[PDB]
Design a protein around this nucleic acid. Sequence first.
RNA 1: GGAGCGUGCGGUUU
RNA 2: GCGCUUCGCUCCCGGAGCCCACACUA
RNA 3: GGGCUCCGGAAACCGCGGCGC
Lengths: 334, 74, 53
Amino acid sequence: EVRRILPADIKREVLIKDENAETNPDWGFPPEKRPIEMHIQFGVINLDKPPGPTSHEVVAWIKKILNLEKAGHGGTLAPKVSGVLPVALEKATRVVQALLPAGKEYVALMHLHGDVPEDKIIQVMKEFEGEIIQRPPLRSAVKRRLRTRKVYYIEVLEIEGRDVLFRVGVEAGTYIRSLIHHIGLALGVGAHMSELRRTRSGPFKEDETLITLHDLVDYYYFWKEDGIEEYFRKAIQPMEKAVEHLPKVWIKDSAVAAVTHGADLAVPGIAKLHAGIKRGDLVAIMTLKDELVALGKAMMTSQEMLEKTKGIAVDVEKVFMPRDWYPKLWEKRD
Amino acid sequence: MKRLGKVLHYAKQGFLIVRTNWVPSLNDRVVDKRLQFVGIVKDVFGPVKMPYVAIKPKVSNPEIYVGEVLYVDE
Amino acid sequence: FRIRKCPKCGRYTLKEVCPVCGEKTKVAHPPRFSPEDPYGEYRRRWKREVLGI
RNA sequence: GGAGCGUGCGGUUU
RNA sequence: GCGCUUCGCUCCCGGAGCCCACACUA
RNA sequence: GGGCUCCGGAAACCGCGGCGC
Ligand SMILES: [Zn+2]
């Protein structure tokens, strides 16, 4: 069924804090149901970067052509590398953060500097599956710890003589020329990187959603000139996508405005949350309409976030949602 | 000094590849089964359990070591 | 470039035929873009045609 | 006339 | 001969504007 | 006093330098 599952993948259970809590449809804007302009305002482009230009030029171009005021990308690719590169727009740019720690998946062509029997190649390839060393130690720095890097899988699809084609899943900042070169050394003959192309960046996949500069630009003009949304619409993802992999907590409509005005989020405002949350880690706070509000770091274990009733549970750090959308509802009595 | 491993081959780029059970480090003196200085290290890389030590030699003759236990001087 | 894909089927390869799949493979990396995009005009004409606009 | 991710230095038009 | 040398994000320093919110119980 | 948002921390050159076809 599968050999390709990363830490981002693992499906995390919803635990319900208040059974009854419910969202008034009138306030806010559910992602895939918000006006084209606002959809752009808070959206992310899953772009298929071409080889040639640097990761930012591409961005720069998009900004220019779409007449945006701001854009930016998370995780830069070398100009020769193509593939999945998410481009965040306008009010959404900061989301990018989320993606940096997130797992990567690639397709790579390995050229060899010498003929190794095929049978033994897919064997030395194997042993590079799991906890791998990514920098040598004993310096002046008499250390604790060490530089382990995680490689989730190595899959060899094809191998003609000196060229080797393989797919691979990797942890955050695994340098990829660096890996081939090392297996190169290890086989002896020596190797390098013919091509490379990113098939995954966290929630971002090479799928029905992945768009080239060409269709992008073009769908844009279809909207601007012919007045046709759907095509250009289906090109922009919501920002809520940039967090699909993260731990989330869902909060009563009452709580939102406080947070949008930069209040930290306290236990009585949580409707439901993800299991397995631990202390001080990035979390995304969502309205019951599954729209994002802010990012913070967990102050409590999810495992008990629900058992407690008062106190704070997320130092809110980044306000995405506008203050506008939700009324001020802390106009209480005592 | 503990043992390092059997030399599996010579890398065409200029390194002795001794396969290992424990991790050494950058600039460790590597010797021969009779304390004959062989080289210094430049890389350990691969499975944290059973790694690879790559050696950049500094005597003119490299390939003599294939299939030998190159001990790792402290 | 060398890396290839079943269009219909999505698998990757170096071969020009899909191993156990239908059609002929295409170069994986997407075609190059220039910011001038001197010819988009034409392209869009084409595209309109292909998808009733 | 601020630092880093990241390569910068010399002169002129606020 | 052509292109690139940074779109952005984090940190510091400096404004300006919102706010001080344990979450209104149907 | 505590947070959150937004605007700063320059732009247009010409000379060298660096990077890639
Ligand atoms: Zn196929």
